[PDB]
Structure formats: C-alpha cells, structure tokens
C-alpha cells in the first residue's frame, strides 16, 4: 500500500510509486529519474500517464519498452499545466534526466519534491527563488554530520591525474571504470578525454548511454573494446578474480589495469582526504575507491533547507526505522532554530 510520502495532497498525483499496482485516485504517475528503486514496477504494459523528463522518457521507451503515448515528457524550467495543475520540472543535479518537481496547488499551497538531488547554490537562483514553498519532500540519504565528501570537480581532478600519469608511464596499461546504473558518467568521460580515447563498453551499456542526449556522444563512446583504452565494466566485476578474468579476454594487448570504483560515502571518508587516497593491490591490478557522490552532503542539504525556509519537511529516504525518523527531526529542529523560520 502506497506510503503517504509518495502522494501529493489535493491532486491525483503520485511520485515514484510504480510498485503497488493501481493507486486508487491517481490520474498521473510522476517518475523523478531512472534508478531501479524509483521505477520498480514499470513495464511495456503500463497504460497510465507517466510524466517525466525527455531523457527519462527515452529510457522508459528503449530500456523498459513503454508505449510512446503513455510517456509524457516535459521540458525543464517551463511552467506547464498538467490536469489543471501548474507544475515545473527542475534539474536535480543527480543522474542524467533526474528532476525535482514544483507543484502549485489550486488552494495556494506550493510543494517541492526533490526526488534524489545533490543540493547546490545554483538552485537558489532558479524558479524556486520566485515564491514561498510550504512543503518539502526531501532526499535525506546523507542527513547526518559525519557525511562529508569532496566536490565532484575535486574528484574529477584526482581521476584525470591518476589516469594520465600511469598511461604516460606505462602505455600498455588499461584504465577500467566500474558502473551499475546511470550516473557518474563524468568520471569515465573525463578520463577518456585526457587519454585521447573513446570509452568502450558492452552493447547494453552503449544502448543506455545513447538515450541520454549527451552532445557529440558518437565521438565519445564505442562498442569496439579492442580499439579503446578506457573500458567500462559491471561494478560486481571490479575485483581481482573478475579483473584477472577480463585481463585475459583482451588477448595480450595490455599488461596492467588501473581501475576506479566511484562509490558513495564509506567509513574511510571519516579519516582520509581525497588527495591522500590509495588502492588495494594484488599484483598488476590496482583498484581505486573514489567518493564521487550524486547526493547532498550534510552541509549542502542544510544550506539548501535553511535558504528554502519550508513550513514543513517530509523525508523520503531512511524513513523505515523510528530511530532514523527521530534523528532526522532533531536536525530539522536545530536548523529551523538557527535560521529563525
Ligand atoms: Ni537515485
């Protein structure tokens, strides 16, 4: 049974709620972005409207095979009427095609649903700046002060350097990057760009990337592995036994892999900076963990909420235990007292 934090009051609208069957009263099903926890349930047999971004639309049509008519894509940054309710989609700074959604209720209430987001100061000069937001449905993935991590630009720097160093030192080494969903494309695109290569990948991953409206994408990616010196592999596969396995398949063309595992937070963020990172090493294979986050840090979230001064906050992440719920409320109360709203 659909939880109350996936419903929008005063509408027939639900958000990311595709796994409960038909939801009685729901005229419209919004999907914030193409990540399986959010889309769990969709298929070719869905005959209700889905409102989403164009890119999310492309992924629905091509990867899940939903029928063109039941996908309603919308442009971003554009006031749009949807069953006689004004809505806007806003860039969420999460993965490709990920959006936040502003709902303007007839009664005068204004609700922001963040989907998954990495909060940023550029959002403070968006359409959100123009009016009061009464309710906030919030991505609380990292709502605790331990959760610090570097900027994406800091991390891309490290990467571009590690990779380019080694390739110029040993020109028969391979760069690998791990992946399992959309997101974090900048990691491999940046490495390939500095090495003068295309990124090589499976047919299924090539298919996914060709739906993302990345400019000049035909010049950046290929399904020909042999021709390329940056390769993508399943994240499950980014380990010694599996990298060994893969190092065979290339057939005497490379004598060293240098892998990267972009991950979220891990407990070594609490004691080690980004300039001072190391890999695990079992012979000629070296696996880097690098903390490229597409979710708000604690400080980023805090700043965004304190600027927004919402009258009410409804968490969408870590809401399954009373302890987490209670911990989160305490932070929201601190923030509001500091800020005077
Ligand atoms: Ni996500």
Swiss-Prot record:
Expressed in brain, heart, kidney, liver, pancreas, placenta and skeletal muscle. It is found in: Nucleus. Induction: During mitosis. The mRNA encoding this protein contains an internal ribosome entry site (IRES) in its 5'-UTR. This 5'-UTR generally suppresses translation while specifically promoting expression during mitosis, when cap-dependent translation may be impaired. May be required for DNA interstrand cross-link repair. Also required for checkpoint mediated cell cycle arrest in early prophase in response to mitotic spindle poisons. Possesses beta-lactamase activity, catalyzing the hydrolysis of penicillin G and nitrocefin. Exhibits no activity towards other beta-lactam antibiotic classes including cephalosporins (cefotaxime) and carbapenems (imipenem). Binds constitutively to TP53BP1. Binds CDC27, which is itself a component of the anaphase promoting complex (APC). Binds PIAS1. Belongs to the DNA repair metallo-beta-lactamase (DRMBL) family. This is DNA cross-link repair 1A protein. The chain holds residues 700 to 1040 of 1040 of the full protein.
């Amino acid at each position: 049974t659909c939880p109350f934090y996936k419903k929008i009051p005063g509408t027939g609208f639900t958000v990311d709620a595709f796994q409960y069957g038909v939801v009685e009263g729901c005229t419209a099903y919004f999907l914030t972005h193409f990540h399986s926890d959010h889309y769990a349930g969709l298929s070719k047999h869905f005959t209700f409207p889905v409102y989403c971004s164009e890119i999310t639309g492309n992924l629905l049509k091509n990867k899940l095979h939903v029928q063109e008519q039941y996908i309603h894509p919308l442009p971003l940054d554009t006031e749009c009427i949807v069953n006689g309710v004004k809505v806007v989609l806003l860039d969420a700074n999460h993965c490709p095609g990920a959006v936040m959604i502003l709902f303007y209720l007839p009664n005068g209430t204004v609700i922001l649903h963040t989907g998954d987001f990495r909060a940023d100061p550029s959002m403070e000069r968006s359409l959100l700046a123009d009016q009061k937001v009464h309710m906030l449905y919030l991505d609380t993935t990292y709502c605790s002060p331990e959760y610090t991590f570097p900027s994406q630009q800091e991390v891309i720097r490290f990467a571009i350097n590690t990779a380019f160093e080694a390739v110029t030192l040993n020109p028969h080494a391979l760069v690998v990057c791990g992946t399992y969903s959309i997101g974090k494309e900048k990691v491999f695109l940046a490495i390939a760009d500095v090495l003068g290569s295309k990124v090589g990948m499976s047919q299924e991953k090539y298919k996914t990337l060709q739906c993302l409206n990345i400019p000049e994408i035909n010049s950046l990616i290929t399904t020909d592995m042999c021709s390329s010196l940056v390769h993508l592999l399943p994240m499950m596969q980014i380990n010694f036994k599996g990298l060994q396995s893969h190092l065979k398949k290339c057939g005497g063309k490379y004598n060293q892999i240098l892998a990267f595992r972009p991950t979220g937070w891990t407990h070594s963020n609490k004691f080690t900076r980004i300039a001072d990172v190391i890999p695990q090493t079992k012979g000629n294979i070296s696996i880097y963990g690098i903390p490229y986050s597409e979710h708000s840090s604690y400080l980023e979230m805090k700043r965004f909420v304190q600027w927004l001064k919402p009258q009410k906050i409804i968490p969408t992440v870590n809401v399954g235990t009373w302890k987490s719920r209670s911990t989160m409320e305490k932070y929201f109360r601190e923030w509001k007292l500091e800020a005077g709203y």
